[PDB]
Design a protein around this nucleic acid. Structure first.
Lengths: 1012, 384
DNA sequence: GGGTTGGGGTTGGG
RNA sequence: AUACCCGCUUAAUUCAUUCAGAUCUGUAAUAGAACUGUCAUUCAACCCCAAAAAUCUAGUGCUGAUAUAACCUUCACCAAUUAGGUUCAAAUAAGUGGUAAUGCGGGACAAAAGACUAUCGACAUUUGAUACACUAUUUAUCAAUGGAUGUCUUAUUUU
């Protein structure tokens, strides 16, 4: 079967595209056109360039460019003149590589932008190419072909032809959208409960005022006649009249009332605010917890909303049954998650058009065209639903509640009464003022920065016993001519610091940024441990508390000024990158295009004017590849320049004059840099790397002074250290404590996790709380101290799992959405730690087992939501899956194809291309059986799947088991032929398979892989 | 424990019919010394859905079949004829019934559920045959009323129940009655004692309801055995002569319609319809008026071969004459008040009233269509 | 009299 | 749980009143009584890094298996634990957690073959052809097809 390969050729990939009919390298094209002959001699560099250059065309034009004996080939014009002639011949066409950064004016061409690819076009290789070709043929070759030149080991740069991005590109009604997002984060409070004074409910105090304030709905195009509009206006008048008779205080007191000790909490808050001395930490934590335990329940809020709706909206506006359906769906909407939303169709598909009685049709289409009448009335029913919701429900929730999410509860939603949130805000302000925030006056801040930079907003998330402030910088000042926010202003410096991050990795400290770096460091340490001979290992884990706020602005500025890794001037280049996806190559239904095999990404890069080794000036890109598969890059014509002085000014401004607002009250930071800026992580990493390299001198020489293996990484403020010497670990702890004492920062909770036990009295570590565990846990990862294997940490309950899942389903692209979602869920974390250099076969099997067990529970809500819609009413799916078991067939197809793709990717990641195809197939079958067994075991108890689907899944699992057994049996005969010589990895795989006795059954490996 | 359950079940219905014979005779009672109202309601209700009663009832089985699991509400029992007599609150009555049946042996009860559950499901037809074997047919009963005497004197063999019809015939005790025995073995034993009857006389004529006329004391199976031939002769006989049945069935559907079913004024003819206009468009144009009508697409101008004059004319038969007049008002096109309409982009002419002879002929072929509609089904059925 | 590029989508670490 | 039909659902005072302005009273300074205005920079959505990406009509070795097996069985649902069955599918379960539960009051025709012109080209069906729709529509006419529908049965209250 088709397998993914780590090594691929651009020509081979291009020959698999149906649109392109002629694909060949330049040398063979020239030989076919007889412009050159084999007996002719050329320079070795020119020959290599001709061989490596790849051209392609939509049609076969070899005859058109055949050598003509009418006139020889001699060149007298310049290469620029030939290029200008070709560009002029191109005319009005505006999608070609050669036109980038230039414009045509009559028979004159003008260059006005920087294009880094022009060097290849005007190179001596292209000069000799033109000399061989001739002007008249070159001008048309630059248009009729797509030219790709190799500039790296696997990279190619397109220099001519139609831009590749061009290949990556009667109306129907679209219903409005429920504005659910407006409910969150409303800090406003009013003397009388109800809605905002700006609403039409309060603005009215006749039909004239209501019409004026509700024109947007009154003059809608869905209304058939003026009588319908008048009836709707009368209904709105009745709604407005009914609204003013609602006792909001009584409703609140009945359904969602304040706790009994609310007065006590208010008195405590007032006393804490008025107290001059610092408040008691445990008392404040208890007050925080007591305030946070006053949340309202979903059922309570649903009853509140239902009671509000019933006595305010006439029952005949929607119909007797439709009103009840809407009320029932209101609860589902209420309990709906943060980044999730409902749709109008969710109500329309379940109510009946004919229930409405006041609907009138100008033409008697009720009996002639029932479907047309139904559509016409649906267009009005949806409008009514959207109006009711977005005009009553959302404003009430916004005005009378603060709605947000907690710290460690994921995406789950919580509600709090407004006075409780006012008390929480006062207490949080009191807490922040003493530590890091100060009330500020606009007189102090200079007007230059005042008009040059926008300010930020502050948001508070509840936490167990405390809070968690978050400051945002999305806003932009309409006045003072500001059109960008802080991130848009600073993304240039962000690019510069991202460039800095590359040499920040290994030069001046121990900093890591991605799982690839973590994995390669782990692999190197594992190899060194293997060389040493598997001795005992000890680990220590600690982290910094509030790293961002503990940053010295003067020290950071001094480091920035004296750091030579940042050059004076930089240039910004933009380019497009085309990269191979994770899809195997089809072997030759007819519509095959570039997006089927390549992914388009937009990239920016900053480069210095030095004669650097990477010579970015020659190429225009800097990309890292983990495989030999090719990729294509095309440049752009939008360059930018950034100077170190501008970065210095930005850093000084953000360090000194950082201004944020809260409840229309301005604040200013006193220490550290604000979290949430795009440069904060890199700046923090650099700042702490300086101190850690200052205080970790001994580690630089320890590995050869006494030959001790030791590994230290720091991700942002989190530290992990594994070594062989308890003395080395203790020395590191002591040095880190000394550095913290000297630089005025501290570690979180005074807690440290170790693998050993030592007397803390000797090293003045009495205040520390040492926790001893035999299994290390770092950044959510689980590491063994015995086999030195790594696997991720997964939750254990469906309630925990569901809190972090947002479900969004659209009928238009069900197949694509579900396939991509399942693919992402499986490949989220497993691909980054499936390195065979780290785990053994058993370790990989266990990792896959646990990850699949987590992912199935993760994805279960998706099919639960899917079953709420019957696909038999949709032709697009019924024609493909019948009408009896459409849902079951659709789910089976999705699961089967997703599992097959995941297994193929897993085999590609695990094995190299040199391994035997039989071994690859056997391992793929084993993985498929594991996944299907997990899925079947999970789903065998569910009631919705209890019938038709389970038999199909059991059949699939049985087929996979049979195929695995058959492959294992045939592999013995295959190897017995002596036709193949096995390497060490193949021998290891054979030994593993024979030890686990995969020939007969799987019962041997299950205890080893399912152990927890 | 089905083997336990089966034996456990067989005890219950035995205790049930045991109580039934006692309560009708009022032989035993606990009265009010130790309440026992719980046992009284127990006997009452699991008799109310005992096998024999449901065999006679055949309704509570349906009502429990309505429920998915067949668990049924307590409230249904409160409306019963002789249940409310307990007296002395429905929220309390449900708890009383529930803790009365909490130790019951045929009713599953738990977690204060609102439903009650007989512990053995359906098995209606199987009980029908077993009871039929146990039942016995009696056809020697003079009209004398000695029901209590009958039950007190028939204490000779174990009898499940005596089904004496009431008021089906004249007076109270005229019917020939039905009796079931404890088992098929008990019925065979009663047959062994040749014509088991009152002890003073079992083979000869006597007094009272059991006066022993033509002594047809046989079980249900031989009762149907003797039924078989006599019933089947009458049931089969000979098939009805099918030649004239359709002609007889013509009359009402054929020869009165034009004035009884649809009045002659309800018919409206349309002319000058261009060829190439499918009748769907024409019926849509008539539907534009909104009334109910029958469309006879006039292509056969002879009005009773594939007539060549296709789509030229049309016939509309409304349900009501007043609706026809309302359509005429609608067809009175207010722009010109002309008896015409446009179909497929072409204006065609309509006829408000047709001469009564042509109306009668059109109704005649309409009734011919009705007769052949009745003929197709009649010939279809005549072979069965 | 016009004018970055505005989104779509929401997982797992920090 | 058919949740089939109907009705209302503690239906009654306030649990509570930020910020700002404007009054009265008191105070060794605290406070108390009453009033008015009020989402926003008019839009709200935190960031870093990495992940995936068909214009998803295109797709399975469509599936021979491990009685050391797989299925099935409880008065809602889910989460789990035990007992019992069956050999390509049916029969009869016992606990333990969480969650839905509102609640009351009133209500509750059978079935295997018939007698059936009682009605119907104005009956009903799988379809199949056309139009009206299509983002998860509730259908009109011809074609074909043959029963369908409605009563009485055979049956009846410790219903």
């Amino acid at each position: 079967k088709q397998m993914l390969t780590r090594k691929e050729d651009l020509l081979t990939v291009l020959k698999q595209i149906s649109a392109l009919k002629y694909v060949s390298n330049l040398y063979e094209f020239l030989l076919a056109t007889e412009k050159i002959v084999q007996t002719s001699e050329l320079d070795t560099q020119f020959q290599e360039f001709l061989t490596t250059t790849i051209i392609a065309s939509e049609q076969n034009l070899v005859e058109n460019y055949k050598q003509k004996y009418n006139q020889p080939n001699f060149s007298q014009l310049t290469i620029k003149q030939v290029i200008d002639d070709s560009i002029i011949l191109l005319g009005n066409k505006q999608n070609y590589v050669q036109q980038i950064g230039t414009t045509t004016i009559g028979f004159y061409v003008e260059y006005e932008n920087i294009n880094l690819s022009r060097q290849t076009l005007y190179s001596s290789n292209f000069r000799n190419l033109l000399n061989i070709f001739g002007e008249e043929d070159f001008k048309y070759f630059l248009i009729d072909f797509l030219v790709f030149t190799k500039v790296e080991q696997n990279g190619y740069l397109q220099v001519a032809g139609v831009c590749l991005n061009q290949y990556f590109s009667e109306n129907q009604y679209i219903y409005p959208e429920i504005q659910r997002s407006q409910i969150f984060y409303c800090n406003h409070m009013g003397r009388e409960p109800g809605v905002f004074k700006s609403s039409f409910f309060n603005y009215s105090e006749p039909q004239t005022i209501i019409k004026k304030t509700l024109l947007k709905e009154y003059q809608s195009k869905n209304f058939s006649c003026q009588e319908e509009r008048d009836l709707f206006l009368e209904f709105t008048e009745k709604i407005v009249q009914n609204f003013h008779n609602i006792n909001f205080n009584y409703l609140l007191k009945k359904f969602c009332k304040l706790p009994e000790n609310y007065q006590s909490l208010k008195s405590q808050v007032k006393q804490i605010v008025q107290s001059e001395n610092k408040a008691n930490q445990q008392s404040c934590e208890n007050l925080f917890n007591s305030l946070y335990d006053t949340e309202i329940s979903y059922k309570q809020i649903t009853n509140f909303l239902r009671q509000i709706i019933q006595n305010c909206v006439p029952n005949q506006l929607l119909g007797k049954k439709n009103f009840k359906v809407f009320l029932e769906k209101l609860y589902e909407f209420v309990q709906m998650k943060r980044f999730e939303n409902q749709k109008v169709l969710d109500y329309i598909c379940f109510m009946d058009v004919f229930d409405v009685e006041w609907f009138v049709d100008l033409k008697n289409q009720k009996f002639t065209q029932k479907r047309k009448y139904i559509s016409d009335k649906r267009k009005i029913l949806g409008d009514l639903i959207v109006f009711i919701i977005n005009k009553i429900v959302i404003p009430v929730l916004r005005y009378n509640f603060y709605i947000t999410e907690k710290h460690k509860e994921g995406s789950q939603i919580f509600y709090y009464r407004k006075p409780i949130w006012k008390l929480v805000s006062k207490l949080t302000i009191v807490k922040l003022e003493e530590e890091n925030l100060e009330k500020v006056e606009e007189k102090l801040i200079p007007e230059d920065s005042f008009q040059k930079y926008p300010q930020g907003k502050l948001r508070i998330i509840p936490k167990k016993g405390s809070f968690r402030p978050i400051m945002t910088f999305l806003r932009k000042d309409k006045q003072k001519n500001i059109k960008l926010n802080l991130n848009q202003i600073l993304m240039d410096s962000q690019l510069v610091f991202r460039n800095l991050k590359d040499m920040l990795g290994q030069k001046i400290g121990y900093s890591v940024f991605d799982n690839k770096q973590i994995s390669e460091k782990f692999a190197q340490f594992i190899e060194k441990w293997k060389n040493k001979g598997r001795p005992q290992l000890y680990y220590v884990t600690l982290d910094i508390k509030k790293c961002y706020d503990s940053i010295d602005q003067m020290k950071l500025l001094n480091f920035f000024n004296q750091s030579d890794l940042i050059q004076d001037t930089y240039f910004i280049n933009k380019y497009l990158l085309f990269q191979r996806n994770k899809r195997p190559l089809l072997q030759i239904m007819d519509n095959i295009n570039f997006p089927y095999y390549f992914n388009l990404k937009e990239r920016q890069i900053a480069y210095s004017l030095y004669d650097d080794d990477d010579q970015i000036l020659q190429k225009g890109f800097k990309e890292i590849q983990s495989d030999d598969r090719p990729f294509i890059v095309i440049n752009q014509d939008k360059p930018r320049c950034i100077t170190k002085d501008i970065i210095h000014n930005h850093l000084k401004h953000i360090s000194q004059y950082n201004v944020i607002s809260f409840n229309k009250v301005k604040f200013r930071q006193k220490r550290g840099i604000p979290q949430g800026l795009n440069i904060s992580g890199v700046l923090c990493s650099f700042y702490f790397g300086k101190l850690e390299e200052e205080y970790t001198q001994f580690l630089k020489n320890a590995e050869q002074v006494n030959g001790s293996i030791n590994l230290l990484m720091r991700l942002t403020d989190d530290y992990l250290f594994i070594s062989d010497s308890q003395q080395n670990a203790l020395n590191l702890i002591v040095q880190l404590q000394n550095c913290a004492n000297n630089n005025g920062f501290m570690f979180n909770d005074q807690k440290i996790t170790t693998n050993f036990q030592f007397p803390q009295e000797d090293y003045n570590l009495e205040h520390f709380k040492i926790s001893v565990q035999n299994e290390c846990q770092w950044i959510g990862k689980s590491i063994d101290m015995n086999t030195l294997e790594i696997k991720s940490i997964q939750k254990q309950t469906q309630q925990e799992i569901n809190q972090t899942i947002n479900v969004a389903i659209s009928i238009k692209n069900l197949k694509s959405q579900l396939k991509n979602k399942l693919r992402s869920l499986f490949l989220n974390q497993l691909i980054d730690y499936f390195n065979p250099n780290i785990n053994s076969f058993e370790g990989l099997c266990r990792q896959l087992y646990h990850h699949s067990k987590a992912t199935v529970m993760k994805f279960y809500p998706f099919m639960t939501k899917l079953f709420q819609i019957d696909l038999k009413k949709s032709k697009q799916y019924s024609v493909q899956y019948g009408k009896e078991n459409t849902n079951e067939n659709f789910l089976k197809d999705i699961l089967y194809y997703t599992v097959e793709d995941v297994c193929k990717i897993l085999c590609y990641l695990q094995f190299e291309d040199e391994i035997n195809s039989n071994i690859k197939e056997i391992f793929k079958n084993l993985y498929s059986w594991i996944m299907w067994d997990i899925i079947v075991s999970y789903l065998k108890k569910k009631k919705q799947f209890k019938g038709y689907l389970n038999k199909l899944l059991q059949k699939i699992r049985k087929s996979r088991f049979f195929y695995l057994k058959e492959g294992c049996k045939s592999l013995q005969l295959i190897l017995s032929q002596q036709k193949y010589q096995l390497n060490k990895k193949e021998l290891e795989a054979i030994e593993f398979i024979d030890l686990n006795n995969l020939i007969q059954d799987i019962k041997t490996l299950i205890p080893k892989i399912s152990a927890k | 424990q089905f083997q336990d359950c089966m034996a456990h079940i067989t005890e219950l219905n035995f205790k049930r019919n045991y109580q039934n014979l006692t309560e009708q005779s009022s032989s035993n009672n606990v009265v009010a010394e130790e309440l026992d109202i719980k046992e009284s309601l127990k006997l009452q209700m699991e008799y109310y859905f005992c096998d024999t009663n449901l065999t006679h009832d055949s309704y509570l089985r349906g009502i429990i079949s309505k429920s998915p699991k067949n668990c049924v509400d307590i409230k249904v029992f409160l409306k019963f004829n002789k249940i409310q007599q307990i007296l002395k609150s429905k929220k309390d009555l449900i708890h009383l019934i529930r803790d009365s049946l909490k130790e019951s042996k045929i009713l599953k009860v738990k977690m204060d559920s609102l439903k009650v559950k007989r512990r053995f499901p359906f098995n209606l037809e199987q009980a029908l045959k077993n009871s039929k074997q146990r039942t016995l047919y009696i056809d020697f009963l003079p009209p004398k009323c000695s029901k209590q005497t009958l039950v007190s004197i028939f204490g000779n063999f174990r009898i499940i129940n005596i089904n004496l019809p009431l008021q089906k015939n004249s007076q109270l005790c005229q019917g020939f009655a039905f009796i079931e025995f404890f088992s098929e073995e008990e019925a065979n034993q009663a047959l062994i004692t040749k014509n088991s009857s009152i002890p003073k006389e079992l083979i000869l004529l006597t007094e009272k309801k059991i006066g022993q006329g033509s002594i047809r004391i046989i079980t249900y199976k031989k009762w149907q055995e003797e039924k078989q031939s006599f019933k089947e002769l009458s049931k089969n006989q000979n098939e009805q002569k099918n030649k004239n049945m359709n002609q007889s069935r013509k009359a009402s559907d054929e020869f009165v319609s034009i004035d009884v079913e649809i009045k002659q004024n309800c018919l409206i003819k349309i002319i000058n319809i261009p060829q190439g206009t499918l009748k769907a468009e024409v019926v849509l144009a008539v539907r534009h008026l909104g009334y109910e009508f029958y469309c006879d697409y006039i292509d056969e101008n002879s009005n009773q071969l594939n007539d060549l004059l296709k789509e030229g004319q049309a016939m509309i038969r409304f349900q009501n004459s007043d609706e026809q007049r309302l359509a005429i008002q609608k067809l009175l096109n207010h722009n010109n008040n002309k008896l015409q309409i446009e179909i497929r982009g072409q204006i065609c002419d309509v006829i408000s009233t047709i001469p009564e002879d042509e109306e009668k002929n059109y109704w005649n072929y309409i009734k011919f269509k009705k007769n052949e509609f009745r003929k197709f089904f009649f010939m279809k059925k005549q072979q069965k």
